[PDB]
């Protein structure tokens, strides 16, 4: 109950110097000063602590600063507040095909440093572009070929509203011939907190980790499904009950239970294990080229698509036919097919209904019959809440 | 040699005496008073090089005679061998009077060892190409800086970048870490009824 | 029985080799559409078996094309192509190796072909460097190389108190006199006095 | 009733197997507990 | 040369004496009176904190790692041939010099025959300056060598069918849709006959057409293109009993 | 030469005693496994 | 089973509270607390020992830490008494004593 | 139910057979790994 009062309390910049005294003792953020004191205060490992904290120390001896696709950067001289900047990489389309890493590193305010290593250099292109999701070319370098397995550094100016919201940096190697231009894009999003509220949120995050045994980006994903700006709440704990109850109750996996609890298919991969996205869509790379959740319109009626790559990937990923995928999409919209956009928010909920068939040992056609005689006949599963 | 031959025949109370003739962590008593040293072999206290040119053949004994600190660490790991085999001999008898003896030998071995280096290790590597790591100019600059180190060279104060970035890094040995891991495994089995 | 829809079966029958006239030939993209339609109807085990088969077929396509068109003229067979490109194209899909171990095997086969002068024009003064004078015993494989380098850095792991390069005759005579199953304190003190 | 009596006599057969396994275990255990004999160590002393 | 070798020996011994006293395993140890080498500060000043940076075993960064063995192997082995030679490693294998020495290249268990296919298809893909898909397109129509044409979507399709319907029993049962299935197309399902291989087999050869079909099928004219049994058997992958 | 012959005979007799004890350990482990097996067969016979 | 679980949970509560608030400042972990209070708080509830044997194990671990001078300030003339000259062979355990 | 329990106890009997086969395999494997002993090679040295 007192741990529940730790987890459920909201932290404002007014309330924070009081909650730091209620939760730690003194003020003055430097109360750990090392990784070993953090790991000894909570009984953490190094692998367990690296799921939470990756400080900007040890920069000189590496070229990849991100650990578990995240990097916290505490800046000094911010009126002695020592604010921390957490940036998380999300690893969007064509990342693993075309590059080793792609990292965005904050130098100062409104001053970033894009670091990448190209897998498989491409000589005949020479036109390096870098945009943010079809908006504007941030960096652009004609007559430049990044040679393979080389660590590059590019200074890039990004405003705060662009980076606190979800930005997706899009690395282009275009050739000046109107022939093919090679794309590889990755997603970044920063969060900036003062040191007090950062320690308090890190406190209740580690206490949730050791309460529930659940993964830190699992709980990042249940809190990103419900809210924004990282407010641990009663709804987060209810959904976190339901992910564990579905994972135990059915014999399903972790992100498998996440998709049933109104989360999306996770694109977070680690060097330990591949993401649920690439495990579901790209572990047997189908015709050599891979799948990208692009906003591409596709008619899922079983004769009128003629885009066989995306549709065959959905048939292999969902274990489904043409007809069977089509009724899988009709169930999610109450017997209609409005428009299939091939977004991740459509692949999720095209996978939710397949899970609803599979975890109850129903066929999707048996699921269509059973929903046809339920009180859920033409209801739209697309428009549900969590409780529905 | 007497120590090792007494370990191999499991005469433990004499094996420990013949290890006290070289190293005693409990000091030495000469004329009733405790002494200030812990090594009963004076070329182990002063690093007295027995062997110039130790790299003419692949002999571990020649390298350990070039600096006798390797004999010192070998003596320590032999005492670890003795302590873990005392604990294993007490721990295969499965009586709770002997389980305490086993745990006491294991705790004595871990308190001779101390704390295992866990957060002091790197997990840090700027990942070069194979062409970069195999640079002949880089190897030349390494050997040049090593000879520059041995002649003390006044540290030329002109700040340059780390041109030796792709060098492979020193490694802690397998055997000591194996002693750490086997002791924490033994105490894990003893703090349950395993 | 094919795991597909009847319009998929119609698309497969549309891939008829000899049919009626005025129907065009199927394009490569049409075969690719039928390929992905049939492949999406497989489970995981059949998809893995399919990918293994396709690797074993694309190697004998691509190696024959490479030996024919772009290669040095001296390559005439797949064994000579393994001799050249240093990776074996005749291996089945069930043999697995990490990338640095494959590069190690490649450069080791290169050195083994270059020392016996199977190659074109081997630089003979390179052949007598210290790495290749120590090739046959130490540097030919990873384990002996790592053993020699660990014996350099950690001689403590390879010292035994029983044998030593350069021990005297009286040391061996003590070892003879003490090599028993039964070692009392009186036996070992008589051995030490002797 | 005779089925149950057959079960009883089979139990007695397995118990008399267990007695022989126990005799072997005790005998090889007391052989293993003494490494060498008194005369064997005496012969070692004489060769030395 | 003897002075240089003595100098290399005493650099290695000095490095050994410094690094064997900076071992963090020997730090928290009781009554093992080891003084530091009195050049440890100088070693950390010349080499940027190198004696401070020790590495857990099994790591890519280690001096005993397979990447270190591969590095020493490449240093010593890249000099057997001149750089102009076709047997030099950078010319026969340009991939192997640019290999990133990361932990995943050390640990990830991928298959050989995947690296071999990546190598062959990258070399063909570079020599034609096209995509992977264009390589598979021209490889589906290539007639000049044996064991080719190779229609990769056709191969994937026929093996998916033989994984679903081995022995072709749906042809045996469902007779009215079996009437719509071409027997030569069923031969192409059951055994390896590409569409371009079908165009090789089905074409008629007149004495007018023959010098054109010999160019479409072999290359040059002038019948003496094999000249031996061994060249026939190597062009088609035949035995002697098969030839 | 006679003294080192008899030292060889000493060490050879010590080694044959050590191998004797090792074979006794084999036999002891066999008897312990067989008596556990017969105990479990008594368990399945009680269930029957 | 409940009482065993509750003992294994109250030890990691109480040891952490004790290491935090009232202890010498040199104690930072549970292993250092076993090193200090001479009883192991990481043992499961299924290990059983009578009280005088636990006190024997406590004072024996104290002597083993005091002879190797892991402690703060060991009285060196105590270290050469006849009981501790005969420690290693005889007095280290109950059976040889 | 008792039939199924008899199957369980028979499984435990076969597992305790497997433990003895494993002990024999490990023991003869470590005997086979050392060709000769230290004292056996010492005796060879002494005869030579």
Short mmCIF file of C-alpha atoms in Angstrom, two decimals, chain D residues 5-44:
data_model
loop_
_atom_site.label_atom_id
_atom_site.label_comp_id
_atom_site.label_asym_id
_atom_site.label_seq_id
_atom_site.Cartn_x
_atom_site.Cartn_y
_atom_site.Cartn_z
CA UNK D 5 -1.42 -62.18 -2.79
CA UNK D 6 0.65 -62.20 -5.99
CA UNK D 7 1.36 -58.50 -5.45
CA UNK D 8 2.53 -59.32 -1.90
CA UNK D 9 4.92 -62.05 -3.03
CA UNK D 10 6.32 -59.78 -5.75
CA UNK D 11 6.98 -57.19 -3.03
CA UNK D 12 8.95 -59.80 -1.09
CA UNK D 13 11.01 -60.58 -4.21
CA UNK D 14 11.89 -56.91 -4.71
CA UNK D 15 12.79 -56.57 -1.02
CA UNK D 16 15.20 -59.47 -1.33
CA UNK D 17 16.70 -57.73 -4.36
CA UNK D 18 17.12 -54.60 -2.23
CA UNK D 19 18.96 -56.57 0.48
CA UNK D 20 21.59 -57.66 -2.04
CA UNK D 21 21.99 -54.16 -3.45
CA UNK D 22 22.44 -52.93 0.13
CA UNK D 23 25.07 -55.58 0.86
CA UNK D 24 27.00 -54.56 -2.27
CA UNK D 25 26.75 -50.88 -1.36
CA UNK D 26 27.95 -51.40 2.21
CA UNK D 27 30.79 -53.65 1.07
CA UNK D 28 32.10 -51.39 -1.68
CA UNK D 29 31.58 -48.38 0.59
CA UNK D 30 33.79 -49.84 3.30
CA UNK D 31 36.28 -50.84 0.60
CA UNK D 32 36.30 -47.26 -0.68
CA UNK D 33 36.63 -45.75 2.81
CA UNK D 34 40.05 -47.35 3.33
CA UNK D 35 42.29 -46.11 0.52
CA UNK D 36 45.12 -48.51 1.28
CA UNK D 37 45.35 -51.27 3.85
CA UNK D 38 47.77 -51.50 6.76
CA UNK D 39 49.93 -54.00 4.89
CA UNK D 40 49.67 -51.98 1.69
CA UNK D 41 51.02 -48.85 3.38
CA UNK D 42 53.63 -51.08 5.04
CA UNK D 43 54.72 -52.29 1.59
CA UNK D 44 54.90 -48.67 0.40
#
